[PDB]
């Protein structure tokens, strides 16, 4: 009755508002589309958000690393593909590839997801009905994504904090803060000089604590190298980390 494995593949024509002040596809727009394609793929596998919710569990995004080889532009048509590559005790690993009409690999992403128990309020082994899934054959998996990158430990002790509040518009239809909201805050926090003169080549994301509607957060960053920046978003009150990241610029 259902196929054994699924490669989600979607064609999107870029809208004007999906492009930044330079005419390049914005990273939040891309990531939002990636999350949509990943959701459609999960549904085909019977591991969609609703499938999990109805068994009392939910997905959490832990790691996400997006590499932009070449930015598409207004009215370009792009092909977004996504699928699981491997499934282990606690994690599913999901790849994304974005192709130009050209065939050029415009962008790729790797991601790591865990399952949270709604009873236990904590990570649990992936239930059997998720362990059992077959990733698709005949795709070439992107390189491994380190679970705990070294920048996780970096100090932001002297980095100035900028305050932001979780708004209504940042809440998705699953009643959670959209993980893209954090990337938007992080991007707004980047030095004007860098924004005006460089583009992101890669953004590597480590998600820690969940935030809620109305939470106050602090956004920080530190120059790491001539073309890389580290970023931290944390709860202003508790001081708990919500997002840690590295951006590489070119």
Question: Mask of contacts with its own copies, 184-213, x by CB under 8 A?
Answer: x--xx-x----x------------------
| Closer residue to its own copies (CB): 119 or 193 | 193
Binder among 1, 2, 4, 16 for its own copies (CB under 8 A) = 16
Work out how close the CB of 94 gets to Cl ion at its nearest, in angstroms, rounded to a whole number: 21
19 touches, from its own copies, Cl ion, none (C-beta below 5 to 8 Å by class): its own copies
Question: Mask of contacts with Cl ion, 225-244, x by CB under 5 A?
Answer: --------------------
178 touches, from Cl ion, its own copies, none (C-beta below 5 to 8 Å by class): its own copies
Q: Is 76 exposed, middle or buried (0-12, 13-18, 19+ CB in 10 A)?
A: middle
Query: CA 185, CA 164: separation in Å to the nearest integer?
Result: 8
CB neighbours of 249 closer than 8 A, spacing ≥ 6?
Answer: 194, 198, 199, 200, 201, 227, 228, 229
The answer to whether 150 contacts Cl ion (rule: CB under 5 A) is yes
Binder among 3, 4, 137, 169 for its own copies (CB under 8 A) = 169
| Closer residue to its own copies (CB): 61 or 123 | 61
The answer to whether 74 contacts its own copies (rule: CB under 8 A) is yes
| Closer residue to Cl ion (CB): 58 or 149 | 149
Q: Is 162 exposed, middle or buried (0-12, 13-18, 19+ CB in 10 A)?
A: middle
The answer to whether 140 contacts Cl ion (rule: CB under 5 A) is no
| Closer residue to its own copies (CB): 31 or 87 | 31
CB neighbours of 156 closer than 8 A, spacing ≥ 6?
Answer: 220, 221, 222, 230, 232
**Taking every pair of C-alpha atoms in the chain, what is the biggest distance, in angstroms?**
58
Half-sphere exposure of 215 (CA within 13 A, CB side): 24
């Amino acid at each position: 009755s259902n196929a054994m494995a699924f490669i989600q593949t979607d064609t999107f024509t870029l809208r004007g508002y999906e492009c930044d002040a330079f005419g390049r596809m914005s990273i939040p727009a891309l990531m939002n589309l990636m999350q949509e394609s990943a959701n459609r793929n999960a549904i085909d596998y019977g591991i969609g958000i609703a499938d999990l919710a109805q068994k009392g569990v939910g997905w959490m995004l832990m790691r996400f690393c997006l590499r932009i080889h070449q930015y598409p532009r207004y009215g370009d048509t792009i092909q977004l593909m996504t699928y699981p590559t491997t499934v282990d005790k606690y994690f599913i690993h999901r790849d994304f590839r974005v192709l130009a009409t050209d065939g050029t690999l415009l962008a790729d992403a790797r991601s790591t997801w865990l399952v949270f128990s709604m009873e236990k309020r904590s990570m649990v082994p992936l239930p059997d009905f998720i362990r059992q899934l077959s990733p698709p054959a005949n795709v070439d998996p992107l390189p491994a994504l380190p679970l705990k990158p070294d920048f996780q430990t970096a100090s932001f002790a002297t980095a100035a904090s900028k305050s932001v509040q979780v708004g209504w518009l940042n809440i998705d239809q699953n009643q959670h803060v959209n993980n893209v909201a954090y990337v938007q805050w992080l991007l707004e926090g980047v030095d004007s000089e860098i924004v005006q003169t460089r583009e992101i080549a890669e953004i590597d994301l480590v998600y820690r604590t969940e935030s809620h509607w109305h939470d106050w957060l602090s956004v920080q960053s530190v120059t790491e190298t001539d073309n890389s920046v580290l970023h931290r978003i944390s709860q202003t009150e508790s001081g708990k980390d919500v997002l840690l990241a590295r951006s590489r610029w070119r």
